[PDB]
Scaffold this active site. Structure first.
Site, PDB file in Angstrom:
ATOM      1  N   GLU A   1      -1.303  -7.513 -15.039  1.00 37.08           N
ATOM      2  CA  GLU A   1      -0.316  -7.960 -15.958  1.00 37.08           C
ATOM      3  C   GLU A   1      -0.108  -9.448 -15.858  1.00 37.08           C
ATOM      4  OE1 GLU A   1       4.334  -8.037 -14.964  1.00 37.08           O
ATOM      5  OE2 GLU A   1       3.845  -6.160 -14.541  1.00 37.08           O
TER       6      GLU A   1
ATOM      7  N   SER B   1       8.945 -12.958 -11.875  1.00 35.68           N
ATOM      8  CA  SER B   1       7.799 -13.273 -11.202  1.00 35.68           C
ATOM      9  C   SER B   1       7.478 -14.881 -11.371  1.00 35.68           C
ATOM     10  CB  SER B   1       6.575 -12.200 -11.674  1.00 35.68           C
ATOM     11  OG  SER B   1       6.763 -11.181 -11.494  1.00 35.68           O
TER      12      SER B   1
ATOM     13  N   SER C   1      12.590  -8.407 -17.171  1.00 38.01           N
ATOM     14  CA  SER C   1      13.604  -7.620 -16.266  1.00 38.01           C
ATOM     15  C   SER C   1      14.176  -8.036 -14.909  1.00 38.01           C
ATOM     16  CB  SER C   1      13.184  -6.003 -15.926  1.00 38.01           C
ATOM     17  OG  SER C   1      12.705  -5.398 -17.196  1.00 38.01           O
TER      18      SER C   1
HETATM   19  N1  LIG Z   1      15.853  -7.082 -28.161  1.00 32.36           N
HETATM   20  C1  LIG Z   1      15.908  -7.138 -26.646  1.00 32.36           C
HETATM   21  N2  LIG Z   1      16.066  -5.879 -26.013  1.00 32.36           N
HETATM   22  C2  LIG Z   1      16.185  -5.916 -24.645  1.00 32.36           C
HETATM   23  N3  LIG Z   1      16.208  -6.980 -23.976  1.00 32.36           N
HETATM   24  C3  LIG Z   1      16.012  -8.305 -24.564  1.00 32.36           C
HETATM   25  C4  LIG Z   1      15.863  -8.139 -26.181  1.00 32.36           C
HETATM   26  N4  LIG Z   1      15.490  -9.589 -26.482  1.00 32.36           N
HETATM   27  C5  LIG Z   1      15.484 -10.239 -25.260  1.00 32.36           C
HETATM   28  N5  LIG Z   1      15.688  -9.337 -24.155  1.00 32.36           N
HETATM   29  C6  LIG Z   1      15.866  -9.919 -22.960  1.00 32.36           C
HETATM   30  O1  LIG Z   1      14.566 -10.006 -22.489  1.00 32.36           O
HETATM   31  C7  LIG Z   1      14.259  -9.118 -21.193  1.00 32.36           C
HETATM   32  C8  LIG Z   1      13.023  -8.480 -21.219  1.00 32.36           C
HETATM   33  O2  LIG Z   1      11.890  -9.482 -21.207  1.00 32.36           O
HETATM   34  P1  LIG Z   1      10.579  -9.069 -21.129  1.00 32.36           P
HETATM   35  O3  LIG Z   1       9.448 -10.404 -20.779  1.00 32.36           O
HETATM   36  O4  LIG Z   1       9.965  -8.404 -22.403  1.00 32.36           O
HETATM   37  O5  LIG Z   1      10.471  -7.953 -19.909  1.00 32.36           O
HETATM   38  P2  LIG Z   1       9.648  -6.435 -19.882  1.00 32.36           P
HETATM   39  O6  LIG Z   1       8.379  -7.192 -19.699  1.00 32.36           O
HETATM   40  O7  LIG Z   1      10.020  -5.592 -20.489  1.00 32.36           O
HETATM   41  N6  LIG Z   1      10.100  -6.383 -18.023  1.00 32.36           N
HETATM   42  P3  LIG Z   1       8.968  -6.456 -17.005  1.00 32.36           P
HETATM   43  O8  LIG Z   1       8.233  -5.045 -16.527  1.00 32.36           O
HETATM   44  O9  LIG Z   1       9.920  -6.636 -15.496  1.00 32.36           O
HETATM   45  O10 LIG Z   1       7.946  -7.416 -16.888  1.00 32.36           O
HETATM   46  C9  LIG Z   1      15.602  -8.307 -21.135  1.00 32.36           C
HETATM   47  O11 LIG Z   1      16.007  -8.154 -19.597  1.00 32.36           O
HETATM   48  C10 LIG Z   1      16.486  -9.067 -21.619  1.00 32.36           C
HETATM   49  O12 LIG Z   1      17.304 -10.050 -21.062  1.00 32.36           O
HETATM   50  N1  LIG Z   2      14.570 -11.886   3.339  1.00 31.02           N
HETATM   51  C1  LIG Z   2      14.269 -11.612   2.332  1.00 31.02           C
HETATM   52  C2  LIG Z   2      13.609 -11.119   1.027  1.00 31.02           C
HETATM   53  C3  LIG Z   2      14.325 -10.345   0.563  1.00 31.02           C
HETATM   54  C4  LIG Z   2      13.772  -9.935  -0.969  1.00 31.02           C
HETATM   55  C5  LIG Z   2      12.771 -10.698  -1.352  1.00 31.02           C
HETATM   56  N2  LIG Z   2      12.210 -10.280  -2.496  1.00 31.02           N
HETATM   57  C6  LIG Z   2      10.858 -11.089  -3.209  1.00 31.02           C
HETATM   58  C7  LIG Z   2       9.838 -10.030  -3.850  1.00 31.02           C
HETATM   59  N3  LIG Z   2      10.667  -9.320  -4.824  1.00 31.02           N
HETATM   60  C8  LIG Z   2      10.368  -9.496  -6.148  1.00 31.02           C
HETATM   61  O1  LIG Z   2       9.025  -9.961  -6.488  1.00 31.02           O
HETATM   62  C9  LIG Z   2      11.391  -8.711  -7.349  1.00 31.02           C
HETATM   63  C10 LIG Z   2      10.273  -8.216  -8.439  1.00 31.02           C
HETATM   64  C11 LIG Z   2      10.293  -8.865  -9.623  1.00 31.02           C
HETATM   65  C12 LIG Z   2       9.577  -8.791 -10.948  1.00 31.02           C
HETATM   66  C13 LIG Z   2       8.656  -7.432 -10.610  1.00 31.02           C
HETATM   67  C14 LIG Z   2       7.754  -7.086 -12.061  1.00 31.02           C
HETATM   68  C15 LIG Z   2       7.729  -5.788 -12.323  1.00 31.02           C
HETATM   69  C16 LIG Z   2       6.650  -6.531 -11.593  1.00 31.02           C
HETATM   70  C17 LIG Z   2       8.510  -6.831  -9.489  1.00 31.02           C
HETATM   71  C18 LIG Z   2       9.427  -7.337  -8.401  1.00 31.02           C
HETATM   72  F1  LIG Z   2       9.207  -6.566  -7.073  1.00 31.02           F
HETATM   73  C19 LIG Z   2      11.883  -8.728  -4.469  1.00 31.02           C
HETATM   74  C20 LIG Z   2      12.923  -9.681  -3.742  1.00 31.02           C
HETATM   75  N4  LIG Z   2      12.143 -11.433  -0.575  1.00 31.02           N
HETATM   76  N5  LIG Z   2      12.593 -11.742   0.647  1.00 31.02           N
HETATM   77 MG   LIG Z   3       6.757  -8.123 -18.438  1.00 32.39          MG
END
Ligand SMILES: Nc1ncnc2c1ncn2[C@@H]1O[C@H](COP(=O)(O)OP(=O)(O)NP(=O)(O)O)[C@@H](O)[C@H]1O
Ligand SMILES: N#Cc1ccc(N2CCN(C(=O)Cc3ccc(C4CC4)cc3F)CC2)nn1
Ligand SMILES: [Mg+2]
Ligand SMILES: Nc1ncnc2c1ncn2[C@@H]1O[C@H](COP(=O)(O)OP(=O)(O)NP(=O)(O)O)[C@@H](O)[C@H]1O
Ligand SMILES: N#Cc1ccc(N2CCN(C(=O)Cc3ccc(C4CC4)cc3F)CC2)nn1
Ligand SMILES: [Mg+2]
EC number: 2.7.1.33
Lengths: 352, 352
Positions: free
Chosen positions: B121, B178, B175
């Protein structure tokens, strides 16, 4: 006058009080009844009114301070009740720190002839921390860590020596979070802070669960499963995200499973309380980790009253800091963690 | 087969679809009816079923890709509805990224003879981001910033040139969050991440206000006053904290005024929604600032769908990043911010 130091925070007032124990026969005669009344009131009670508490387990006994021997006492009450405290006072030179030394300056001056000396909160924190570690906790270490924090059958509190304390990253978890870099006894700075602190835990926890105290929030959290509210890496990938070494159990999105109505309808108050604690604690640890890396400091000490009677958060910090830093940072804790500002304020007394 | 790239995230599926516009007379004959049905279905509808949407304003027109001319389309639907999508498919080589390329691998293989190629990704994100900026947004800049973000009567969207894009800090707000450090077209790394992202906004907002969509959460937030929930520096100090240059309006404790029962009883849903947005957005900006300082990168670009139709959060990031960095960092934004992974996946098609 009585020797006090006071730290008036956004949530709690912390008071350190030095009780002399070397009062001579003559000194006892030349002591006015109001002073005797204050001293016996403070030393014969553990609860003061409805909201004041003396933390008797923290008392330093037979401390030599300002050329006298005495006991150092540690007392706390809610900032909301400071009007009661000031009104009791209207029935002394006061060294005071915290934001409330400024906010309530005019209120303290309603006590006739009282001299208020405002001292900076982070300057008092550093002085009090270094002082208490130097005198020891009645011969025991003031500073401790959790040994083998990654293995629960081994994880245990162990003493840590701070005799050469520099450099040190101090993470002060109060209502919010301040992060300090301490390079020497007179060279320290506030690196940054975060708004997600103890007040966020308690405020969100109260909104989500209806808890009415910090202790109730922790009791709920102790019974909950944060993974009912949080979305984990394994919920998104089906397992680990191996490419970036993210384990399936890592939280990808705090409260992220609460976007689904049916999950909001099944989650318990206890689950929400624990997710709130985990969310706040992980963010604190992660910000501390980033500051430590930037400051090139590998010892990170956590203070403030967010961690009072809060072993869950301490152990989570210990594990998370060690895990996410691949063992390069160590989480440290202090027995007197909420009171360093109050002690530092008391230590400024000779300057006036 | 049709040329698609798919990014299956924890919340949304994003799909990029290349529509050829140079189909010759012979090619139209030798096209099977199912393919013609797919193409007309995708190009003659803007809503697909009940939850799929084509973002027509983002379409790249008359793009040359893989030696053909066509239009690049951008389509999204909830990951929860992927079973419907796969079932429609059972009524092609699919390049797919996001955690769901792994989690739902077996489901995609229920489509007979379908070849699924999982791509990483963050690798797809970087390729797609660099690609879209390179081809432009139909001759306009893909990248923009908010000029004079500290003055509201002046603050305005302005184009930003990324022709030499390195180095770049990419903050992917999905969600969770990163954070990527991009040093060259083939030298990039995931610095860290945070669990407080878009899913936290939407999950907490739904718990606190009962909103039932992202858009409703933003509408509520637009009407609220976060200072009814948050405890500010001036609530603790009575004004600024001058010693450390903290202005009275800075948030000291997110939701920190919610520790008081009477304030919980007067706060509106809209106030809570805005405090949730402000809390999440400030934490994202602050973590981005700390990573930028550590990585020695001064250009910070924010992507992901947390910022879709979310000018409040974009402007808050623009102001906060500039203010708290004393003007050393600049917040950048991209018109195609939710779709870069899907585009990067589509770009891997020639490798198979
Ligand atoms: N129609 C929608 N439905 C849901 N969430 C939405 C929508 N439009 C915007 N969002 C926001 O966009 C976020 C999701 O962004 P997105 O970049 O698509 O993440 P994702 O790729 O699905 N999650 P991840 O697995 O962490 O990379 C949600 O957490 C909401 O804050
Ligand atoms: N003390 C101390 C301490 C406590 C926590 C901490 N984290 C850093 C690493 N984290 C992360 O990247 C959290 C996270 C965010 C997005 C995703 C996407 C699906 C791929 C995946 C995903 F895992 C979680 C929080 N770092 N330090
Ligand atoms: Mg995403
Ligand atoms: N009895 C208690 N009442 C309230 N909060 C408590 C109590 N015990 C522990 N806490 C926690 O401790 C936090 C306050 O810690 P403390 O270090 O005293 O901050 P403060 O100094 O009052 N705030 P600040 O102005 O930001 O420095 C609260 O946010 C709670 O999370
Ligand atoms: N982009 C970007 C961005 C956005 C925000 C941001 N902040 C860093 C500075 N903050 C803080 O110290 C927050 C804070 C915490 C505790 C206190 C105590 C009363 C003294 C006071 C107090 F102010 C607030 C958050 N940094 N960067
Ligand atoms: Mg404090």
């Amino acid at each position: 006058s009585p020797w006090f130091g006071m730290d008036i925070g956004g949530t709690l007032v912390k008071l350190s009080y030095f009780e002399p124990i070397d009062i001579t026969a003559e000194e006892e005669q030349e002591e006015v009844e109001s002073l005797k009344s204050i001293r016996k009131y403070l030393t014969s009670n553990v609860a003061y009114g409805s909201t004041g508490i003396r933390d008797v387990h923290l008392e330093l006994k037979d401390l030599t301070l300002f050329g006298r021997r005495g006991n150092l006492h540690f007392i706390r009450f809610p900032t909301q009740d400071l009007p009661t405290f000031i009104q009791m006072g209207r029935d002394t030179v006061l060294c005071a720190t915290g934001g409330g030394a400024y906010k309530f300056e005019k209120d303290f001056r309603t006590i006739g002839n009282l001299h208020l000396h405002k001292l900076d909160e982070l300057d008092c924190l550093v002085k009090g921390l270094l002082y208490i570690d130097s005198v020891s906790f009645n011969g025991q270490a003031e500073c401790y860590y959790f040994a083998n924090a990654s293995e629960p059958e081994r994880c245990q509190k162990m003493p840590f020596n701070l005799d050469d304390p520099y450099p040190l990253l101090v993470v002060n978890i109060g209502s919010g979070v301040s992060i300090l870099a301490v390079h020497s006894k007179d060279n320290y700075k506030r690196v940054t802070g975060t708004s997600l602190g103890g007040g966020t835990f308690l405020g969100l926890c109260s909104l989500l669960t209806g808890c009415e105290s910090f202790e109730e929030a922790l009791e709920m959290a102790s019974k909950g499963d944060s993974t009912q509210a949080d979305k984990l890496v394994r919920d998104i990938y089906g397992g680990d995200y191996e490419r970036f070494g993210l384990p399936g159990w890592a939280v990808a999105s705090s409260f992220g499973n609460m976007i689904y109505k049916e999950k909001r309808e099944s989650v318990s108050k206890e689950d929400l309380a624990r997710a709130t604690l985990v969310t706040i604690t992980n963010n604190i640890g992660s910000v501390a980790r980033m500051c430590a890396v930037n400051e090139k400091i590998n010892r990170v000490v956590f203070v403030g009253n967010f961690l009072r009677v809060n072993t869950l958060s301490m152990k989570l910090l210990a594990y998370a800091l060690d895990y996410w830093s691949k063992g390069q940072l160590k989480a440290l804790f202090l027995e007197h963690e909420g009171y360093f500002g109050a002690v530092g304020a008391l230590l400024g007394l000779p300057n006036f």
